[PDB]
Amino acid sequence: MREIVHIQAGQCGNQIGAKFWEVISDEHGIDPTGSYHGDSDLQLERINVYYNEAAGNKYVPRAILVDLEPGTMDSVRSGPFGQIFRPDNFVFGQSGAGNNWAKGHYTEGAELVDSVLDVVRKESESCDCLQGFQLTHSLGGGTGSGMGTLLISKIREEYPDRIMNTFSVVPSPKVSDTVVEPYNATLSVHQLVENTDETYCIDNEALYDICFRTLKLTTPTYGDLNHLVSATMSGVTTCLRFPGQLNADLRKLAVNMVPFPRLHFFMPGFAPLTSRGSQQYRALTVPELTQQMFDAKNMMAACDPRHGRYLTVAAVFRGRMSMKEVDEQMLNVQNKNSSYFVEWIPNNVKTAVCDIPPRGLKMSATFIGNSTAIQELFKRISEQFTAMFRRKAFLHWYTGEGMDEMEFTEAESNMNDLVSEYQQYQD
Amino acid sequence: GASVKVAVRVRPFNSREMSRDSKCIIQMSGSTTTIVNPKQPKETPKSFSFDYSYWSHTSPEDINYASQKQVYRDIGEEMLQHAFEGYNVCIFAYGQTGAGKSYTMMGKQEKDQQGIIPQLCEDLFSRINDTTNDNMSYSVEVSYMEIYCERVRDLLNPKNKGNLRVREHPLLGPYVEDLSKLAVTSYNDIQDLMDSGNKARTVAATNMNETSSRSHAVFNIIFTQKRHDAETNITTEKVSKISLVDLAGSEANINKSLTTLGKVISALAEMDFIPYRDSVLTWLLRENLGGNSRTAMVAALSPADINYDETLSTLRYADRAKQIRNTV
Amino acid sequence: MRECISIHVGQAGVQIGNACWELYCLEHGIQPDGQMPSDKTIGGGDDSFNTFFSETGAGKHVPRAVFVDLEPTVIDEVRTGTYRQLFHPEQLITGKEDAANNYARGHYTIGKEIIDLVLDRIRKLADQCTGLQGFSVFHSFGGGTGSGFTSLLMERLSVDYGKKSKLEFSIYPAPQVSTAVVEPYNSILTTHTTLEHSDCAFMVDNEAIYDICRRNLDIERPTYTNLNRLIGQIVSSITASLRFDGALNVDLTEFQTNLVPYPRAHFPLATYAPVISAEKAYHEQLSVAEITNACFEPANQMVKCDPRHGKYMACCLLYRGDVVPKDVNAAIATIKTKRTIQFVDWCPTGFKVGINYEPPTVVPGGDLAKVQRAVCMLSNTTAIAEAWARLDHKFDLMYAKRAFVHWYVGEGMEEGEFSEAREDMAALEKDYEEVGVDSV
Numbered sequence A: 001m002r003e004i005v006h007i008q009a010g011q012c013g014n015q016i017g018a019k020f021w022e023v024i025s026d027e028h029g030i031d032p033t034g035s036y037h038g039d040s041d042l043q044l045e046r047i048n049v050y051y052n053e054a055a056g057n058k059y060v061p062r063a064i065l066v067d068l069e070p071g072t073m074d075s076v077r078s079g080p081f082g083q084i085f086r087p088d089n090f091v092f093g094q095s096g097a098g099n100n101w102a103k104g105h106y107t108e109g110a111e112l113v114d115s116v117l118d119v120v121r122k123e124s125e126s127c128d129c130l131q132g133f134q135l136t137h138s139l140g141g142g143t144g145s146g147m148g149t150l151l152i153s154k155i156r157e158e159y160p161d162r163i164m165n166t167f168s169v170v171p172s173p174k175v176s177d178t179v180v181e182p183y184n185a186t187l188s189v190h191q192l193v194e195n196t197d198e199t200y201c202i203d204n205e206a207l208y209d210i211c212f213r214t215l216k217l218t219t220p221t222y223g224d225l226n227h228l229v230s231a232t233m234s235g236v237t238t239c240l241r242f243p244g245q246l247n248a249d250l251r252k253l254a255v256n257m258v259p260f261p262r263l264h265f266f267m268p269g270f271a272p273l274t275s276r277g278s279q280q281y282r283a284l285t286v287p288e289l290t291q292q293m294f295d296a297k298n299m300m301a302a303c304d305p306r307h308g309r310y311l312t313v314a315a316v317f318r319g320r321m322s323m324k325e326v327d328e329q330m331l332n333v334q335n336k337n338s339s340y341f342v343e344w345i346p347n348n349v350k351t352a353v354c355d356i357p358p359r360g361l362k363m364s365a366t367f368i369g370n371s372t373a374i375q376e377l378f379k380r381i382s383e384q385f386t387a388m389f390r391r392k393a394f395l396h397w398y399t400g401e402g403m404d405e406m407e408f409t410e411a412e413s414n415m416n417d418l419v420s421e422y423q424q425y426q427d
Numbered sequence B: 001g002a003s004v005k006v007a008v009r010v011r012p013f014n015s016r017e018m019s020r021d022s023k024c025i026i027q028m029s030g031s032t033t034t035i036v037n038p039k040q041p042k043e044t045p046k047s048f049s050f051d052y053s054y055w056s057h058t059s060p061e062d063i064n065y066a067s068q069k070q071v072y073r074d075i076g077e078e079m080l081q082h083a084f085e086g087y088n089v090c091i092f093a094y095g096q097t098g099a100g101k102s103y104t105m106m107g108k109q110e111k112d113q114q115g116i117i118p119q120l121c122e123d124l125f126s127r128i129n130d131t132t133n134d135n136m137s138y139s140v141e142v143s144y145m146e147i148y149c150e151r152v153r154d155l156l157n158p159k160n161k162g163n164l165r166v167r168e169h170p171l172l173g174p175y176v177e178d179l180s181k182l183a184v185t186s187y188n189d190i191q192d193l194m195d196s197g198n199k200a201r202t203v204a205a206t207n208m209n210e211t212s213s214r215s216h217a218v219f220n221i222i223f224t225q226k227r228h229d230a231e232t233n234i235t236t237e238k239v240s241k242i243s244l245v246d247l248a249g250s251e252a253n254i255n256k257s258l259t260t261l262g263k264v265i266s267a268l269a270e271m272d273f274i275p276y277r278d279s280v281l282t283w284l285l286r287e288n289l290g291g292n293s294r295t296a297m298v299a300a301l302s303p304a305d306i307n308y309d310e311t312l313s314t315l316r317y318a319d320r321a322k323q324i325r326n327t328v
Numbered sequence C: 001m002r003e004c005i006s007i008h009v010g011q012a013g014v015q016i017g018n019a020c021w022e023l024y025c026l027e028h029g030i031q032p033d034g035q036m037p038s039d040k041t042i043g044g045g046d047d048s049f050n051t052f053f054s055e056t057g058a059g060k061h062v063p064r065a066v067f068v069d070l071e072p073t074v075i076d077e078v079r080t081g082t083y084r085q086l087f088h089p090e091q092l093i094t095g096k097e098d099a100a101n102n103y104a105r106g107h108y109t110i111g112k113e114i115i116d117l118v119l120d121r122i123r124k125l126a127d128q129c130t131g132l133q134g135f136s137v138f139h140s141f142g143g144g145t146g147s148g149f150t151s152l153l154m155e156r157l158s159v160d161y162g163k164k165s166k167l168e169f170s171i172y173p174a175p176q177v178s179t180a181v182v183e184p185y186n187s188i189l190t191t192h193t194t195l196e197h198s199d200c201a202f203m204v205d206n207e208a209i210y211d212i213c214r215r216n217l218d219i220e221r222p223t224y225t226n227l228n229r230l231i232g233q234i235v236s237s238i239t240a241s242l243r244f245d246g247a248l249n250v251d252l253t254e255f256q257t258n259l260v261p262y263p264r265a266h267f268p269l270a271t272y273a274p275v276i277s278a279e280k281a282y283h284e285q286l287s288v289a290e291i292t293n294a295c296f297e298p299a300n301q302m303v304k305c306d307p308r309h310g311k312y313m314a315c316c317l318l319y320r321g322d323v324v325p326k327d328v329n330a331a332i333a334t335i336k337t338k339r340t341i342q343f344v345d346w347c348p349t350g351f352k353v354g355i356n357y358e359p360p361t362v363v364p365g366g367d368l369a370k371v372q373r374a375v376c377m378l379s380n381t382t383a384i385a386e387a388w389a390r391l392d393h394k395f396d397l398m399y400a401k402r403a404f405v406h407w408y409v410g411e412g413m414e415e416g417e418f419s420e421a422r423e424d425m426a427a428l429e430k431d432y433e434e435v436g437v438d439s440v
């Protein structure tokens, strides 16, 4: 009624908040329903009663907001798209923001990580049955990286039933930090094993390929990258939520992409990438839309999935097209991709359709999946970790925050086997 | 070089472990210690071999219990004899908070429960007073300091608040500036200084106001032997420095010395540069860790399933120290 | 919210601020720009009630602020004929203790006596507001008030405020310089920061600046009054930028970890790639990402730290104004594409990049461009590893070798302050070198 919990953390999460959510007074945001049926309104609200429950649907913005260094305060709160809301906003009172997992996660966050409990409580209550826990977050965030794992852990701890949906940001061959090797590795052991159900990837090093291949943009931008993601979330969050002929509730999301317990991670795409001008090619196609949903080039992640096999593929299309058309087309993908399909597993591809195409695309395509490929996204941060942080060690910084050989060694070995165990499928 | 000798010792369950119904995950046989993984019982248990694997998990009524007396008679006695030969010596206790470091080094003052330091001091004065060759005379000086958050405090003079500055003598190495060095002529006197010293260590509300789990205590004895001979009339001198260390729990900054000690041990075990100067502890103990000195480590181990990760880490660091060789 | 606390230390420092505090002249302040309508001297902004120091106003309206002068000299300037800048009264200290060049003097001697009152000022100062996340120190490598006084003022601040990493600036000796004292002497001032505390530090190499002014800008004739802007500006990037609203922001606590690779106080270099002439014609505008390279060019380089030697370490770059995301991710890649950068064995995509706005501030002809794209390279490379050697060849022969201390003893301790400062700052040389000399 499948209502919704909004948790936004760090930089990537708060800012990312800025761009997910504004794609919403597009109106469906997270579980009211209604509104969005005959236009109207806008902003950071409407006409009723506040708090909270007008959530992401009519009179209110429901979110749980978590900033740990008053960057998200000012960046959006004020002049920008929102109000937000008041009372729903965290500002860490200067904590001084931390780079380092151990740091808002063990340190300033605990203190706030407790203040984030009150937000979660009030939202949880809302009079609706909440099925999502939505969290933005940043490999190399400390606030996000190790505050997001704190937030995630209690939420799995107290809300076992409610699979967490977490948006991710990652490491690609380009960098932030230097401590992000290991920072996101510790953000890991907790992202597998920390009640985070499914896990999104949003590599910023892969986001560019998209905003620049598919798209033309001449000079991207960090705000424009926020157009990208909205895509990847609306399909999941709005789509299926919003009306629909085969509809997949978030929980279909956790059985469809996880085929087992360790935190199944996914990659996701939006096709309708389009080119402003090129605007003119394939009238929002399905094959079009299927086509773009597998390519090596249209995935909005830092794995190039082609190396290996996917294990689970969840795709979603909400254009008003044939329920026969989407399902008939997705097969063709599956047969020129064998090796990309997991021999176990039949039905290697799930398809969902919802009933309203994104405001102004006319016809949409969202994609989800796990392949064997990710043995990649990590056999990269781990090579990184062993030779980095854990190496000749880089954690004095973190060594004060409170983590001592632990949270490093455990995060490599647990996150490691991830590599072996993951591979296990299809070697 | 002479290898740094290593012993590990497991104690009986403590109140915490008992309140949680902890099972024992440590086994010993000969010089080998084996640890079982409580979370992944499906793996093969990891074994480690040391100079000594002390089983002190039960109580003195057990024939197999490793007593304070055995721990001292093995390593303590050996180091004291080296001091008499004229060698600098060092013994440090390492391990997780509550594993049994202070009990091993200091112990208690009753019941033959006294640790390495009290026993060595007593043994030292007994040997000196047993001398029958009038051509030999002795001098014993003691110093006792605490290292907390890189800050050094004189425990024999808690009457001064200066945080003594650790310096590097241009020719003679590291030293604690103005640290008191007191002459003692009997075991009773040295024990009295030890007692008041133990009374001056930093405590922590967090540890239920018990001695802070984060402070390091370094007990030093400067043993000078003077040998006369009516002849040319020159008295010869032999000076040995005895360093007895009780470290903070392994699990201007709180954990610098301990983390740096780990790095120094790892680097030395590998090499056979070393970050001695990155912490006050490793700086002051530079010659005991790779230098001109006979050194020994006693690693304290919790027997409980709940402390698996910490105990494994201690065993691994003790395994590396075993590979260090000093140049004497 | 995350204020800095700004401390000066010496001649090098009281002025340098004039470069810092003038460069601010855009409505910012240490950590509170949370905004102001005033302008200019600030006179025109109003008087709302008040008195010395301003309750009426925030640091914004008036500063983050604390000048230490051990001679009125520079301080009389900043106080000088209301030198055009009245930036507040009573954030200056002016000690007529008579100035002392010595690490020993002022630091052990006159400074002891007035490091306190200062401590008091700092403390009060450290209190009005919230989040101070920073301590800035202008330091030399020669000026009595800058060595022992700073080894005094950094030492007490480290001891008192362990959680707040200090940032200090430096103006180090090189091939040319002042005094004889400064080959060792700054040595002494180098011991102290060190383990007393300190965080990341920065320098302007005075022999690098006047060099970059001769290889990158124009005016070989130039006055130090101008070299301060090159170094003045370094700060604006470090604090004004990271301290102002933008994309990817590194706070003062970002600075500590990104530079700091291991714990014997580390040192950094500052590169300001925008440095265009008044007499230039940058290819109408200078390419944004070339700006990155500008950095590495040994040429922007503030110091005579021949990168030639070794592998950088930590590389922290702060870009401001009209920078493009795809400029960074895609230009920063490039560097890690030449042979030369030779990052270290444990550098993991070493490069830390921040974007800040607005633009590159500027004032006057002495200021070069209106460049609209900036690179600040703050790095930790092996080099440093050699300039201290330099000071250590000087020292093994200037102070200790045959000793130049009889002035210095006069003011305080012998046989370490010297011996300890050579051996502890020494191993710096060995330890540093071993930080980046093998795979291990």
Ligand SMILES: CC(=O)O[C@@]12CO[C@@H]1C[C@H](O)[C@@]1(C)C(=O)[C@H](O)C3=C(C)[C@@H](OC(=O)[C@H](O)[C@@H](NC(=O)OC(C)(C)C)c4ccccc4)C[C@@](O)([C@@H](OC(=O)c4ccccc4)[C@H]21)C3(C)C
Residues within 6 Å of the ligand: A019, A022, A023, A026, A215, A217, A223, A224, A225, A226, A227, A228, A230, A231, A234, A235, A272, A273, A274, A275, A276, A279, A358, A359, A360, A361, A362
């Ligand atoms: C997203 C998308 O389709 O971005 C692009 C850029 O490359 C993408 C392909 C599209 O074909 C293109 C180019 C359009 O031509 C389309 O007619 C259109 C739609 C569908 C708008 O998008 C919407 O109205 C959607 O409802 C979109 N809304 C959306 O992006 O809303 C924001 C408020 C985030 C903007 C959305 C998508 C999926 C789920 C939910 C919503 C966004 C557009 O501005 C436009 O984006 C751009 O020009 C552009 C330039 C730089 C950065 C971003 C977008 C859009 C317009 C109105 C032009």
Ligand SMILES: Nc1nc2c(ncn2[C@@H]2O[C@H](COP(=O)(O)OP(=O)(O)OP(=O)(O)O)[C@@H](O)[C@H]2O)c(=O)[nH]1
Residues within 6 Å of the ligand: C010, C011, C012, C013, C015, C016, C070, C099, C100, C101, C102, C106, C140, C142, C143, C144, C145, C146, C171, C177, C178, C204, C206, C224, C225, C227, C228, C231
């Ligand atoms: N670049 C630069 N260097 C400066 C500036 N002011 C001082 N210095 C350098 O600082 C060093 C010492 O300057 P002094 O003025 O002697 O220092 P001080 O504060 O007088 O020294 P004391 O009398 O001991 O306190 C010299 O090498 C100068 O070159 C300045 O504004 N810019």
Ligand SMILES: Nc1ncnc2c1ncn2[C@@H]1O[C@H](COP(=O)(O)OP(=O)(O)CP(=O)(O)O)[C@@H](O)[C@H]1O
Residues within 6 Å of the ligand: B010, B011, B012, B014, B056, B095, B096, B097, B098, B099, B100, B101, B102, B103, B104, B211, B212, B213, B214, B247, B248, B249, B300
């Ligand atoms: N071999 C042994 N036999 C019997 N009891 C022992 C023992 N070793 C330790 N104990 C007991 O275990 C408890 C904890 O030991 P102890 O206090 O010496 O540990 P520790 O010094 O490692 C703590 P910290 O790290 O905080 O300094 C004490 O009550 C002590 O008497």
Ligand SMILES: Nc1nc2c(ncn2[C@@H]2O[C@H](COP(=O)(O)OP(=O)(O)O)[C@@H](O)[C@H]2O)c(=O)[nH]1
Residues within 6 Å of the ligand: A009, A010, A011, A012, A013, A015, A016, A098, A099, A138, A139, A140, A141, A142, A143, A144, A145, A169, A175, A176, A177, A204, A222, A225, C248
């Ligand atoms: N997509 C996206 N990535 C961001 C944004 N801000 C920062 N990042 C990226 O995420 C990394 C971590 O930044 P941030 O989220 O501020 O980190 P944290 O808050 O310290 O964990 C950076 O290295 C950037 O690459 C943003 O607004 N959007």
Ligand SMILES: [Mg+2]
Residues within 6 Å of the ligand: B101, B102, B103, B246
């Ligand atoms: Mg103890």
